[PDB]
């Protein structure tokens, strides 16, 4: 699954939840992968896509809303986009996911 890898990343790796943190990490070049929820607004989604193209950061389109993505991460609040600074113990980066 993809939820197990995300949960392992949150448990052991390094991550940023939210649009502002994701954009800041994209600017700083510390992002390895950005997971985008399907519920995010179109303008912010396009801005994130352009920033990822500029920073050459891999993009994964999550199959669910921001609340499903928040539950997958392990937080009881909605998250619209996640950025993976360090995979840590998990292998989400290796499997092209």
């Amino acid at each position: 699954s993809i939820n197990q890898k995300l949960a392992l990343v949150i448990k052991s790796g390094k991550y940023t939840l939210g649009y502002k943190s994701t954009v800041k990490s994209l600017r700083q070049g510390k992002s390895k992968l950005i997971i985008i929820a399907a519920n995010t607004p179109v303008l912010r989604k396009s801005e994130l896509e352009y920033y990822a193209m500029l920073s050459k950061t891999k993009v994964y389109y999550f199959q669910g809303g921001n609340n499903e993505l928040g539950t997958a991460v392990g937080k009881l609040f909605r998250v619209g986009v996640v950025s993976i600074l360090e995979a840590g113990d998990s292998d989400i980066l290796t499997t092209l996911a």
């Binding site: 809303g65 609340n67 539950t71 009881l76």
Partner: protein, 42 residues
């Protein structure tokens, strides 16, 4: 003299039992409430 010790031990134990029960009740209620709230946005 010892009646006060017996009374306060019994009272604190009953309070602890009621606290455990009410925490279990509220935990179930809020978990159901947050699940329903999270699912209502779609």
């Amino acid at each position: 003299e010892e009646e006060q010790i017996e009374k306060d031990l019994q009272g604190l134990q009953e309070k602890q039992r009621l606290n455990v029960k009410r925490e279990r009740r509220r935990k179930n209620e809020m978990k159901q409430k947050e699940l329903q709230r999270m699912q209502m946005n779609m």
